[PDB]
Design a protein around this ligand. Sequence first.
Ligand SMILES: [Cl-]
Ligand SMILES: [Cl-]
Lengths: 443, 443
Amino acid sequence: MLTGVIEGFYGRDWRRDERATVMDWIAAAGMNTYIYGPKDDVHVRARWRVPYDAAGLARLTELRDAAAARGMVFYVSLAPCLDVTYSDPQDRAALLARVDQLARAGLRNLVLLFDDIPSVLPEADRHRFDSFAEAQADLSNMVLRHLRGAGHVVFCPTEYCGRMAGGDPRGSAYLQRLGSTLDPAIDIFWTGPEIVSEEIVAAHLAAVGEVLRRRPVIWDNFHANDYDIRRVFAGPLGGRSRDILPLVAGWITNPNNEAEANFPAIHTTGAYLADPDYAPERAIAAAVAAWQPRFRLAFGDGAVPSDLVALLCDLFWQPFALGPETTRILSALRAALTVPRPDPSDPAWRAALEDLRDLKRRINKLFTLMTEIENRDLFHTFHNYLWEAQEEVGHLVAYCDWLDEAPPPGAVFPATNFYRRGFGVAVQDILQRDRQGRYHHGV
Amino acid sequence: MLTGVIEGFYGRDWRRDERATVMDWIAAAGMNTYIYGPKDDVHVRARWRVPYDAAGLARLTELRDAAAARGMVFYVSLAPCLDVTYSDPQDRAALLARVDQLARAGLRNLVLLFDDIPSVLPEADRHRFDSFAEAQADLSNMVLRHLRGAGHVVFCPTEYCGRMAGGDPRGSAYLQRLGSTLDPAIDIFWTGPEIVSEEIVAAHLAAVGEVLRRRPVIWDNFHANDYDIRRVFAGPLGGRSRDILPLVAGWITNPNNEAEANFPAIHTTGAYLADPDYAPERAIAAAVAAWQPRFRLAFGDGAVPSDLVALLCDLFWQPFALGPETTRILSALRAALTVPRPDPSDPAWRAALEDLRDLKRRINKLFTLMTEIENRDLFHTFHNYLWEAQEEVGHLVAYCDWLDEAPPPGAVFPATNFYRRGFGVAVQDILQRDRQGRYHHGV
Ligand SMILES: [Cl-]
Ligand SMILES: [Cl-]
């Protein structure tokens, strides 16, 4: 089974030391694959016809050797999809020359990406190929046949999730033609019913396997989506049962473009793949214990305490869920805010308010400690998210402190995809602002 | 400030390796004192007039040297209270000979215990001393004066908690006389308003200091009471604010007679004494992280996972509280058991029941893993408590599984100090048994 990480994002690519770090994490998680395809690298996609110069090729061979030393197979990406004429001898030759340059260097493991195509097939292709599917498969088979039995090919389809495929993937003309034309030795990426899938279920993957005529390699965007750079997810992998593993040929985690964000994603995904009894809250506890040394404070032996690293995960948990600890604190608050004016002597209101004030104290401590850690990149990764978390809990405690002083009914607080969730969203959910500018809690 | 542990319990005394282990823990917690007084040692109390033989004395000198190497001061106990004639030249001489034997050996730090006395003063004393207080103080001053400025004395009073002193400690004739007769250089132990105090508060300790005419050394029985061997507390120190520390002269933790039970007691007490921001749930998280290596599994590198060590603490938390995680799980169950027949489709009942089944799974895993650890004494310490926890959660899940199958109203489940709390008690609290033998949940 092919398992690991794809470096495929926009923005700065990873430094050599960052790539080493992430590879160590992949190896320790019991995974076995690193795929290289950064948007930073002009050769992968934007100018895919242009072979690497001598130095670039050498950078790739050294990465391979670095992954090999760790027990990992190294793949190189090629994305000849934006402006290819699939039948054109010159374009076919250009793709084969890319493949040949890599293969001769001993880079024989390739990913061919077709996720961004024109609306209509080029009329140079239309009499020879009946579809994009037929065209992409022929071009990819050509690559496979060139490698002469040494090397492996993974294909990223144009329709790579259920919504793009039209719902039921068996209903897609593209996928139907792809499954019957693409050589069986070529693997195919799949992200689930959506680009970022809340759940990936057995029945769904059975349908995918039917139409692809093979089990897919999962390309999981749960922790990161190349086209959503405003989010960080440090919680455990969730929404995928162990019972789907006999239905897949691999598991490739899409990483956050910030290297340091990815520790729990990789650690818990590793646990999911290896352990029959995987349970997300137990897995995240294990990841917090292993992650904590990276939180060493500058100029000392101490580190951010475990309880506060666990809070970091809880606050920035999953795309469709706040972490369990902060969810319960906010839910107990909602349940005491069923009345317009909470009774300050009420035990339930009092309990809910103390756990909120305590949550603010712990966020404030975590925020301050993070500014003081030795690993400055880890600090930068979480700073703005923690800044916003701090401001939001600040506003909510201020609001509830005001309700606790028992204001008159008429007084107002003095100023200064729907499955998706987060701390910021959950706070505003409770503390709303009406058309007049007035904060309230939905009476 | 005098801080650390007193080995004063009944049953087997600690082995040499056990004493070393506990001393390491005391040193790492930033504490500085070890007090030796086991019930096993016939010389301490039962036959207090009898000096040690050569070998016993040497065992004590080696313990001192062992504590010294770790940055700890070693004390020896003497309890000449059960059958002493305070005025008797022979008994005075016998006590001074004990003190002299220890002092000459370089054991100059003594605890004098008066916690178990006759109902009435001996009539040989009654004309010369007006009270037990006056008598005990004279005898203790004598010990102090014998040490000639090198050495320190701590006094355990007959009335050592507020209930024994009659409520307000300033109201006690014994304490009033003790405070004005006992040399000011002698410290005095105090356990709080009760033998095992739920809270120790500032106002209370201000009163104690008034009548004792000195700040007391706290003898805290929070985690263990020599006369309650059916209990284990692996949660954090709670119920004592940092604001009481300027009101005390010391902090001596009473340990569980099982050495391995004491890791979190000592770790969190250390944190309480050192950190202005002490918070019990954060402290217990730190203790779980430091404790976990002791849970290495036999024949391997792995250990019991952190989440399950944390569960061990949560289940066996404090004398007046179940841990927070299990408290919430049981409280959500109570709130869904407000009806005689829970509706199986009800979301609230469903959530409560799944968290209970999950709690059973995790207890079962913890129980089994504990049987497999390398440190067999750690296993023995918790085995019977975990056995009972497992049986109790077993019965409760069985009961709730039966309610989930929606039985008719009339059907019955087929068989097979009030602040105090525990997992077992909390479970029976919910799942009761009426005068006919029928289990129910208080409709
Ligand atoms: Cl810690
Ligand atoms: Cl762990």
